Design a protein around this ligand. Structure first.
Ligand SMILES: Cc1cc2nc3c(=O)[nH]c(=O)nc-3n(C[C@H](O)[C@H](O)[C@H](O)COP(=O)(O)OP(=O)(O)OC[C@H]3O[C@@H](n4cnc5c(N)ncnc54)[C@H](O)[C@@H]3O)c2cc1C
Ligand SMILES: Cc1cc2nc3c(=O)[nH]c(=O)nc-3n(C[C@H](O)[C@H](O)[C@H](O)COP(=O)(O)OP(=O)(O)OC[C@H]3O[C@@H](n4cnc5c(N)ncnc54)[C@H](O)[C@@H]3O)c2cc1C
Ligand SMILES: N#CCSCC(=O)O
Ligand SMILES: N#CCSCC(=O)O
Lengths: 393, 393
């Protein structure tokens, strides 16, 4: 059969599978024992009570708090304080959706210079304890969303390979951010080619994001875990819910779709995230799970799902600069939960901030978001710590 | 179809360089007016920079700064303080881009109930001294942008007419907000039908927004001014720059068009606004101009262009709730410029607030926006009072 025919066919089959058909296997995989659910509820209650206690009871629209620096040099200087406490960083040179070849070339050079600076700052700390970088493929090919995959692939692959080689040379992480649903397939084919490229051998810093609001998420994870097994690379896998929900809904409506590529009920994304976390936690020999979330209930659920055995390098949590520090200050550190957290740290100016800021406003301003609900007087602590899997079981 | 309508259609995507010369000419003011406006603008900006207005005051992503109240009853109670200072209100029941019949029906009921509450609160103060309402056509039809314009107008017409008749019953203003460029034509056709409908005779509260960032703006104004003169309806015309610029640019780039329906240089929109303001000020016999802006240079130019004769009902300024009060506190009242300002006042829950908030983020966060520059230490007062015609190059 075609290489990985079964795994690839499962991804394609899920693309726009009816939401009601996607959920039952996820609900079963996300169901935890009463004993774990009770312990997770107690942990989540503590995290929320601490969140407010140290921040005047609270759980800017201009978003200066979302950018760590205007240049990589400035961002690296401002990272020392939180690294001393046990946080790590992943730097994001802001910029995406290149419209011209010159723009894509400028973004490439920004990433290249950033890797040199981050690699020097890492100073041999390696991919888990030291800083890394995150990149967006849409920054590196003009009209990434429009051109045929063969053209986008043949030009993008040498650029990403060159960046990955530099990250290998400094032994830092290099993560491919996940963007719109229609570019998942291309990005995953690129990940495969890089993981099978012998020039990158011996480096486990290649990382890839999977969005749990997507119907393909568990099948993409199956493909990635199998790719790790056959390539010999321990792939870093950032599990997120997803940043483009409002845009995906609008696009699917304009595409005339009867079934969308993302879930439309928020708790279905929560169930998908927990089910996918269970899959990742059973594969830590071959992937490095990175649980990106600001939701204290999700965090507590995974913390207890992962069990008592932990070492740095097994898995980590992640958060966004300007959103997650108050929560993760109750997580990192021996007297807290003793689990590491990597801060995603945007670097740039107003000329590159708006697209990211809009996604942050849609995240922070939505009534369904944990970060909004924690400040909503109508939402009880009972509701914040409730397991969403029990709502749909 | 008419000569005036043909001028609108022909300008839809006219090359930007061809649009500018007639706007530059019409926006050119005499030396005496330019000097007086520079003095007034400097005074306003010096007062603004003693305050803490602009983008830095936009508050948190909860959006609290931008919403007047959760319900119309709450919003009406909170309007008394500013109404006695010389402000009026236009209430906006939040909600737009209905995707289902149920949603469009709910938005209709919200508008209808707001008209009854606003009309009772107006208590015979009339369309200039008393409060009004603003509506979005996309809230009232479930496929406003995705169905044939002819059919959309025909189903929308009875709903808008019913709301207009209620507004006539109480003698309040009812404004149709302007949305995306591809719906200008439909909304203008609806305005014409309403202004020729004898059931609405004797009421001057019908209002309509025109966006100066659009290439069709001056020609839309010529059509509306002629419609007012021939119909005997003193149409309230809200002149704005426009709220959807980023979306219009992205849509136009995707559609592969060489010439967009909006200007692409901010200074061109500023020139267009002043040119269109000159056209409206020459037509105050037949239309009621409403100059919506937070830009102190734009305001000062219009104040001087309008001349010394003023009476309530000649024209007014307008601002957005949570953005315009610092500037307009230097305008309303007998100790200031003694000109009225109507506050656009959103009403609704946090859920319905989100889409409006995104447009406020794009407005407040853009380095080119007056409200951002007023706080920017790199921007001089000299630059803020520059006359757009003298700067365009
Ligand atoms: C370090 C880090 C890196 C990230 N990288 C990426 C990336 O590369 N690509 C990407 O797309 N996202 C990425 N994200 C995720 C995104 O930016 C948001 O931070 C995340 O989705 C919020 O989830 P939460 O668990 O913190 O919050 P929660 O409030 O628990 O969940 C909110 C999420 O639920 C989803 N949602 C909301 N409404 C609905 C609905 N009606 N139906 C279904 N789902 C719904 C959306 O995904 C929304 O963001 C990243 C997040 C972090 C912290
Ligand atoms: C009471 C009120 C009601 C309004 N109603 C509507 C409505 O119904 N529909 C609507 O679309 N808008 C409406 N607006 C306008 C919109 O929401 C913004 O408030 C307004 O455009 C900001 O203009 P300004 O003169 O305050 O600021 P300025 O800073 O002087 O101007 C900013 C504006 O310039 C334009 N612009 C920015 N960059 C560029 C560029 N590169 N090229 C071209 N133009 C550019 C945009 O229109 C932007 O908003 C309304 C505004 C007010 C105050
Ligand atoms: N969050 C995150 C990293 S990728 C999506 C975005 O940039 O918002
Ligand atoms: N400003 C304004 C009223 S209409 C456009 C929007 O709602 O942003």
């Amino acid at each position: 059969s075609r290489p990985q025919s079964t795994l690839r066919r499962a991804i394609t089959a899920a693309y726009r599978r009816p939401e009601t058909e996607c959920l039952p296997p996820l609900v079963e995989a996300a169901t935890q024992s009463k004993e774990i659910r009770d312990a997770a509820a107690s942990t989540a209650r503590k995290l929320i009570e601490a969140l407010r206690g140290k921040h005047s009871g609270s759980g800017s629209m201009m978003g200066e708090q979302f950018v760590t620096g205007e240049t990589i040099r400035e961002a690296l200087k401002r990272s020392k304080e939180l690294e001393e406490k046990g946080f790590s960083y992943s730097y994001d040179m802001l910029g995406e959706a290149a419209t011209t070849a010159a723009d894509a070339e400028r973004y490439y050079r920004d990433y290249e210079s950033a890797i040199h600076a981050i690699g020097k700052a890492s100073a041999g700390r390696g991919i888990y304890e030291g800083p890394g970088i995150s990149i967006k493929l849409s920054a590196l090919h003009p009209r990434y969303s429009r051109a045929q995959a063969a053209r986008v692939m043949g030009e993008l692959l040498p650029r990403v390979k060159a960046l990955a080689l530099l990250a290998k040379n400094y032994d830092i992480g290099l993560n491919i951010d996940a963007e719109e649903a229609d570019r998942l397939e291309l990005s995953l084919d690129l990940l495969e080619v890089l993981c099978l490229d012998g020039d990158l051998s011996g480096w486990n810093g290649m990382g890839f994001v999977v969005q749990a609001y997507g119907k393909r998420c568990p099948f993409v994870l199956d493909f990635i875990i199998d790719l790790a097994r056959r390539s010999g690379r321990r792939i870093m896998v950032r599990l997120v819910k997803g940043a483009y929900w409002d845009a995906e809904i609008k696009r699917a409506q304009l595409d005339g779709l009867a079934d969308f590529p993302v879930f439309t009920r928020k708790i279905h994304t929560d169930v998908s995230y927990i089910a996918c976390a269970a899959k990742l936690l059973a594969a830590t020999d071959v992937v490095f799970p990175q649980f990106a979330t600001h939701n204290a209930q999700t965090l507590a659920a995974i913390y207890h799902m992962a069990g008592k055995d932990f070492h740095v390098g097994k898995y980590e949590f992640q958060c966004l600069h300007g959103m997650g520090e108050p929560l993760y200050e109750e997580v990192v550190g021996r007297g807290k939960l003793d689990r590491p957290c990597r801060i995603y740290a945007p670097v740039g100016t107003h000329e590159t901030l708006l697209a990211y800021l809009v996604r942050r406003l849609l995240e922070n301003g939505a009534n369904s978001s944990f970060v909004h609900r924690i400040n909503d007087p109508k939402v009880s602590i009972d509701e914040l710590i409730a397991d969403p899997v029990e709502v749909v079981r």
